[PDB]
Design a protein around this ligand. Structure first.
Ligand SMILES: CC1(C)CN2C(CS/C(=N\C3CCCCC3)NC3CCCCC3)=CSC2=N1
Ligand SMILES: CC1(C)CN2C(CS/C(=N\C3CCCCC3)NC3CCCCC3)=CSC2=N1
Ligand SMILES: CCCCCCCC/C=C\CCCCCCCC(=O)OC[C@H](O)CO
Ligand SMILES: CCCCCCCC/C=C\CCCCCCCC(=O)OC[C@H](O)CO
Ligand SMILES: CCCCCCCC/C=C\CCCCCCCC(=O)OC[C@H](O)CO
Ligand SMILES: CCCCCCCC/C=C\CCCCCCCC(=O)OC[C@H](O)CO
Ligand SMILES: CCCCCCCC/C=C\CCCCCCCC(=O)OC[C@H](O)CO
Ligand SMILES: CCCCCCCC/C=C\CCCCCCCC(=O)OC[C@H](O)CO
Lengths: 418, 418
């Protein structure tokens, strides 16, 4: 009878650490609009989905120890809230995988629909279908007099319905979101202006070129051009070159054009004052215009460490109109950085921890599936202990509601003092 | 007892019209490699999937009338083949929807993965998972002595398994492929070189422009440019213009530049000799180079109706290297046509007819679902007639195996004689 001691303790912890945890998130998210990334818009939805559930936990605690005093309406309410929290939380995490797929795989053109998903579809795809999935809780969940106490849960006409709702749970809860999440990160891990071409091509003017804009020869002869760049790598290739070979050739194109920046006195106090990322943006500008071209700028502002003042000044040139998309990237690189890892890790460890909480519960249910479907035929003492290890794992699983705020803790905090 | 007369007749028709029908497809598809579209590669897979099933139908005919003489191995074989044909056929049609989505929505860059899906993934996505789905037929399908006759079908430990396999059937067979198909055509219906911009922008040189390369004024003044093109449409817009407005402006840009082609004597016997589509390709060439530019070509071949001779000649110019992707489209348009409707209708009517054959069967199963799950509680005479109308609708559904070859009939045939 010790389930009165285990379960109400575990339920009390999640309600207390969840009301404070998820409570702070919703409160802080509303306090400011300036600092809001796409993942932070989704993590707010996750907080509302979890707060709504954590508040129903004291009812779960009382029901474990004593009785369902709350009535028939509140028996329907807690089950409905359990169905919303179950499918929404997992599907919001499926959208965070979808958002991460768009933010990295579509580097350039991404924010365009990333907002469409986060603010518009996030309801059509997550809130509207999850609330529709609660329909059986309204029909089936009911209070009934189990011997000596009022029992409250889903009661169906037959035991076949248990399977219709267990299969549906595995489908919408774990198999379908699991495919989406595992697809997104599978694309992310494997896949992680001037253009890259691994086979010989003619440029805007018809000269033989290969890799990131490297020029072989202005001679119209096919074989004479190949042999002029067969000796640049050190192999008989007949054109076609590897990705790492092109990276070395681009590095040789930079390493030779990067020496010229250090010799030209007009931009050398500008390039040196520039940190790494902004330093590379000027080199990206050099390959396009040339050392004399770029040194005619919008440069006295960039060296003085005046960021936004030089950025708007560069946008008042002809290079801004000649190459519109190609120039905007360069200008934004001076203002900020490599925005054309830590954020990817936070969501990866959030999704990995979400299925970690739910892993001991999955194992439990998987055993009953074999019990009802007659795969394992151990009597009644064994099944009595399988069920004894479902409620504990389900309670332990609920800790997932504390994963989202726990990852927001110690944000910007310097772990230095001892 | 009339099911001996209805069912073996319906089974005999599908085996005879299927062996001839699907037989001819596989045979003809192999005879030539030249004429092969993406849909035709998928329709061959559909033919093999249906031929394999139609050959098992005489066994279905004998089993309806007399007995399962064939044995325990062949009872497992027919069920396995039924599972392959069920999920593969529907999922091949899901790939035809996916291929149609790539061929139309990605107009330019499509054939690239359209081949990846059709030849490489078509096995990983359709053949490999369908053959894995047959596993329960090997375990459950068995011959047993129903009173006075040998009955052969899936026998499980309990009636809960019927639900685990009915829900799985609806999921992999109809709900999941249905979402994919309905998604693809939903995108196709709604969504059905120089670039289109509905808001004022600066061109390569910094002059105010709007729509498909229409030039307002070289004056750097914002309001003076707007008012110069506020009078071109006849409304106070403050920049922003509609899609139909831009189409009228492009038509006014063409209608004025199309008059010039009819006045220049150098190309007027070329433009006039050119049919519609190839005529538009030359206009697309005019807006880029201008009436004097294009009239310097590669033109005496195009007017003489020598197609491929002019195409390779145009690819030997500087315009071919200056605008590589933009020129290749124009050259291909002279060789062939608008390749940058009838094919879309054939697949639409194939998918619509596929679910039409399966519609009376879906209705039948849907009633038993309510019977087992206790939604409708009509005794034993009603259910005896629901089952009496499942086998007929299942037999009538099998006609779907004759849909793929029937659509290949009368191809190129002139319906003129009477
Ligand atoms: C899936 C589900 C919502 C369903 N369920 C269940 C079955 S109902 C139930 N009471 C509550 C479970 C949580 C929702 C409110 C009813 N049983 C017993 C009754 C005796 C005391 C212990 C719990 C246990 S934990 C759980 N979680
Ligand atoms: C889904 C399924 C493959 C399963 N099935 C069934 C149930 S098995 C079955 N015999 C055959 C069905 C087709 C496969 C081979 C067994 N029953 C009766 C036995 C008495 C005579 C009439 C049919 C009927 S039609 C059908 N189609
Ligand atoms: C605030 C702390 C609340 C935590 C409450 C945890 C106590 C667990 C509980 O309710 O235990 C009842 C006991 O089992 C009776 O039989
Ligand atoms: C348990 C409490 C966990 C700590 C609560 C931190 C949650 C919070 O307020 O996060 C701030 C915001 O989300 C950051 O962008
Ligand atoms: C939390 C518990 C709140 C108090 C429980 C209700 C009072 C009562 O009748 O207690 C039953 C007792 O726990 C025997 O099961
Ligand atoms: C070739 C035509 C074959 C068509 C066979 C169709 C005959 C239907 C059948 O087999 O009927 C048996 C009858 O019911 C006995 O009781
Ligand atoms: C029933 C027979 C239907 C007619 C069979 C036509 C199938 C066929 O051979 O089609 C040719 C090819 O697929 C066209 O590209
Ligand atoms: C097709 C039928 C082929 C012949 C049927 C097997 C012979 C036999 O024993 O016939 C049983 C009879 O149809 C009574 O059910």
């Amino acid at each position: 009878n010790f389930n009165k001691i285990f379960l109400p303790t575990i339920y009390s912890i999640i309600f207390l650490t969840g009301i404070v945890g998820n409570g702070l998130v919703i409160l802080v998210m509303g306090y400011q609009k300036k600092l809001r990334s796409m993942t932070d818009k989704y993590r707010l939805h996750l907080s509302v989905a979890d707060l709504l559930f954590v508040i129903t936990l004291p009812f779960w605690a009382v029901d474990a120890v004593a009785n369902w005093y709350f009535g028939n309406f509140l028996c329907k309410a807690v089950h409905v809230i359990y169905t919303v929290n179950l499918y929404s939380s997992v599907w919001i995490l499926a959208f965070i995988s979808l958002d991460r797929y768009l933010a990295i795989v579509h580097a350039t053109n991404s924010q365009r629909p990333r907002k469409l998903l986060a603010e518009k579809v996030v309801y059509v795809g997550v809130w509207i279908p999850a609330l529709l999935l609660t329909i059986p809780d309204f029909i089936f969940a009911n209070v009934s007099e189990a011997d000596d106490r009022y029992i409250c849960d889903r009661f169906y006409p037959n035991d076949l319905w248990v399977v219709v709702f267990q299969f549906q749970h595995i489908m919408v809860g774990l198999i379908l979101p699991g495919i989406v999440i595992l697809s997104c990160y599978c694309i992310i891990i494997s896949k992680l202006d001037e253009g890259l071409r691994l086979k010989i091509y003619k440029d805007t003017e018809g000269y033989y070129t290969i890799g990131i804009g490297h020029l072989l020869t202005k001679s119209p002869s096919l074989n004479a051009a190949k042999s002029e760049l067969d000796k640049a790598i050190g192999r008989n290739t007949n054109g076609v070159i590897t990705k790492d070979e092109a990276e070395k050739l681009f590095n040789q194109d930079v390493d030779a054009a990067v020496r010229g920046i250090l010799r030209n006195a007009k931009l050398k106090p500008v390039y040196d004052s520039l940190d790494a990322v902004r330093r590379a943006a000027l080199i990206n500008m050099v390959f396009q215009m040339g050392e004399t071209g770029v040194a005619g700028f919008s440069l006295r502002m960039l060296q003085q460490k005046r960021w936004d003042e030089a950025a708007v000044n560069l946008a008042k040139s002809r290079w801004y109109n000649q190459t519109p998309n190609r120039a905007k990237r360069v200008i934004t690189t001076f203002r900020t950085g490599t925005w054309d890892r830590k954020a990817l890790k936070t969501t990866v460890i959030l999704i990995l921890a979400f299925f970690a909480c739910w892993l001991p519960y999955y194992i439990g249910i998987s055993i009953d599936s074999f019990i009802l479907l007659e795969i394992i035929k151990q009597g009644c003492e064994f099944e009595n202990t399988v069920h004894k290890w479902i409620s504990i794992t389900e309670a332990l699983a609920f800790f997932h509601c504390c994963l989202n705020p726990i990852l927001y803790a110690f944000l910007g905090a310097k772990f230095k003092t001892s």
